[PDB]
From a paper:
Protein arginine methyltransferases (PRMTs) are important therapeutic targets, playing a crucial role in the regulation of many cellular processes and being linked to many diseases. Then, another series of compounds (12a–12h) were designed and synthesized, introducing also an adenosine moiety and exploring the distance between the three groups. We also report crystal structures with various PRMTs supporting the observed specificity and selectivity.
Structure determinations and refinements revealed that only compounds 12a, 12c, and 12f are visible in the active site of each monomer of the PRMT6 dimer. The crystal structure revealed an unusual distorted U-shaped conformation adopted by compound 12a (and probably also 12c and 12f) in the binding to PRMT6, with a folding at the level of the guanidine group. If compared to the structures obtained in the presence of SAH, the binding site of the complex of PRMT6 with compound 12a is larger due to a displacement of the α helix and the flipping of the side chains of Y50 and Y51 residues to give room for the compound naphthoate moiety.
Author numbering:
A (entry chain B): 51 to 301, 308 to 376
B (entry chain A): 42 to 376
The structure:
């Protein structure tokens, strides 16, 4: 609340050009389906996505926002001359009273690793309560991807200590083992921007989330995930796995893949305890599950099961 | 709590990342290498205490400068890595890594010199200075050498171009996305400037609105500097603005000066925005909102660096300032 009552989080979101342009186009390209229709904007923030919906031809937009920024959104709507058809309503979408069920829901709800501190549950609540049967969901689905990685930045950080002798005339190569323990031997999910160079095998879709589904909400508690299998491109040190997501609008995709333009979500990196050598065509299989943490269900936990080539299957249990 | 804070600092400095950042700070690490090796005449055949030796690199520089013995005292678990580094370089007969706080370590004799990289953000946020002064009183010989010997504090008024971009962001949305959000400028200003937090951020020379002013100096050898720290380190300043600009506040930074070399041109490690960047950046003190100023507008005031009442190591800065003929104002900041 203090967070989304403050400008910084909203500036960061809008300044994510990939994100904001993708939502903009995802809405404006659905003009045929929004023309003369009503929309609920779940967690409307500053109101910018609600105004795109108006530009796409919506006859009415209900912009519901729980934090104090709703005051700024009301100002923005007025300043843009849309108070006749964009209505900012304060408070949680779970208690808000709309005058009618709506033809469409728009929302930007995704967190790091898709589900860390996300507002998905509020979007599903609004879907059940306020979306007419078969209504438009913008976006309508989320797809989760995994790929094994060789992280170039990690390699640079591990190899830093062997370059001190050249910078300052003091040998510190012995610190590589320690650096590896510190940077890989923890059980934290690391949020970091990867490059396409870092991807060691074809990315694998391992789960899908269909936001229209009644029951998705209770499904999340047991975990979202599934198996994967891939074959490595070439020789490299395997450092672990990257997890990322995309969301799909009814007909456009907003991707957070390392192979696509960077976004503020970056990727979620799952490091093994130490590098593992892989060669071309090394087979890697496993399972990834996104789970709520025991102490706080907003906090993301990822359980990783993996098998590299012939080696024994191993597991690592990560938390944000 | 103080126990929780001590544990967090221990875990931080037992981990690689903070040491990677410090050694990768070439401005910092080169300045200490040069300031030490420049003092070879004073260190040849002498004993050195390195307060908070980390991975040991500065203790090794002292050995390379000709010291006969270096005691490298390090409180966090990184002392084990320092031991390995010293052994790797063939120096463990001269450089002795000793675990624990310098306040309770035992050395076989008072030493000829102390070396330490103790500085925090805004100089005194979470710094090791109290530990260096403790070591000086307890282990430094009379007339011994302190490297660096002093710290100096500087201030300059700023028009922060990054801040202006953040404040103007909302007026720019319409050109990119077709939605007018100009009405959020006031909100953005209250959020970004109306707080009382010290902001640590890199500034550029272009952000500097008047000649920087030195407002305090700390001479590490002064037995009595400890009392000055609780009462507040600071001083007064006056500058004249270069040109028209929105005044956003003040930037505070430091330098440390090493003994030896040219008596009139000592070696200095600076964190000024006018000089190459360091990991310490600068400490920015924003006014509640921008103040228009003109060429030759006078700005004067007083800046005091203080301990936070509930954490002596959390930096508090008291700013008293007067812009032109405006009434004098005050703002109290904390890290
Ligand atoms: C009385 O209760 C409160 O005021 C409240 C309580 C919470 O637990 C919140 C927890 C929060 N955390 C997240 O949203 N984390 C997800 C990460 C991505 N976030 C995102 N892009 N959000 C966009 C906007 O959505 C609003 N928003 C969130 N939840 C609801 C809801 N149920 N009804 C209406 N608006 C809602 C937020 O205020 C943002 O402007 C945020 C706000 C919250 C507000
Ligand atoms: C058992 O350890 C604890 O309980 C503990 C408690 C603290 O309050 C600490 C508080 C800490 N905060 C700072 O270090 N702040 C200074 C600002 C920048 N950091 C820096 N340049 N430090 C260099 C190294 O110095 C070591 N170091 C710090 N204090 C002492 C001391 N009294 N004796 C010997 N070594 C010491 C550190 O472990 C670092 O490697 C760190 C560690 C700390 C450790």
């Amino acid at each position: 609340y203090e967070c989304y009552s403050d400008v910084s989080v909203h500036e960061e979101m809008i300044a994510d050009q990939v994100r904001t342009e993708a939502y903009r186009l995802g809405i404006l390209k659905n003009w045929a389906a929004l023309r003369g229709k009503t929309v609920l904007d779940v967690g409307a923030g500053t109101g910018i996505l609600s105004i795109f919906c108006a530009q796409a031809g919506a006859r009415r937009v209900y912009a519901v926002e729980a934090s104090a920024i709703w005051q700024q959104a009301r100002e923005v709507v007025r300043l843009n001359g849309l108070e006749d058809r964009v209505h900012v309503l304060p408070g949680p979408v779970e208690t808000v009273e709309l005058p009618e069920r709506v033809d469409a829901i728009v929302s930007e709800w995704m967190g790091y690793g898709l589900l860390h501190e996300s507002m998905l549950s509020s979007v599903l609540h609004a879907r059940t309560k306020w979306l007419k049967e078969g209504g438009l969901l913008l976006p309508a689905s989320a797809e989760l991807f995994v790929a094994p990685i060789s992280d170039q930045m990690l390699e640079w950080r591990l190899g830093f200590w062997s370059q001190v002798k050249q910078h300052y005339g003091v040998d510190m190569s012995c610190m590589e083992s320690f650096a590896t323990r510190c940077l890989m031997g923890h059980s934290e999910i690391v949020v970091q921007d990867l490059s396409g160079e870092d991807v060691l095998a074809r990315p694998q879709r391992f789960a899908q989330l269909e936001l229209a589904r009644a029951g998705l909400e209770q499904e999340l508690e047991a975990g979202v995930g599934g198996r994967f299998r891939c074959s490595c491109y070439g020789s490299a040190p395997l450092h672990g796995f990257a997890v990322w997501f995309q969301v799909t609008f009814p007909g456009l995709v907003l991707s957070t893949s390392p192979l696509h333009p960077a976004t503020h979500w970056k990727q979620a990196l799952l490091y093994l305890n130490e590098p593992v050598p892989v060669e071309q065509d090394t087979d890697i299989s496993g399972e990834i599950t996104l789970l709520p943490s025991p102490d706080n269900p907003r906090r993301l936990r990822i359980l990783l099961r993996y098998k590299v080539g012939d080696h024994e299957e191993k597991t690592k249990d990560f938390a944000m």
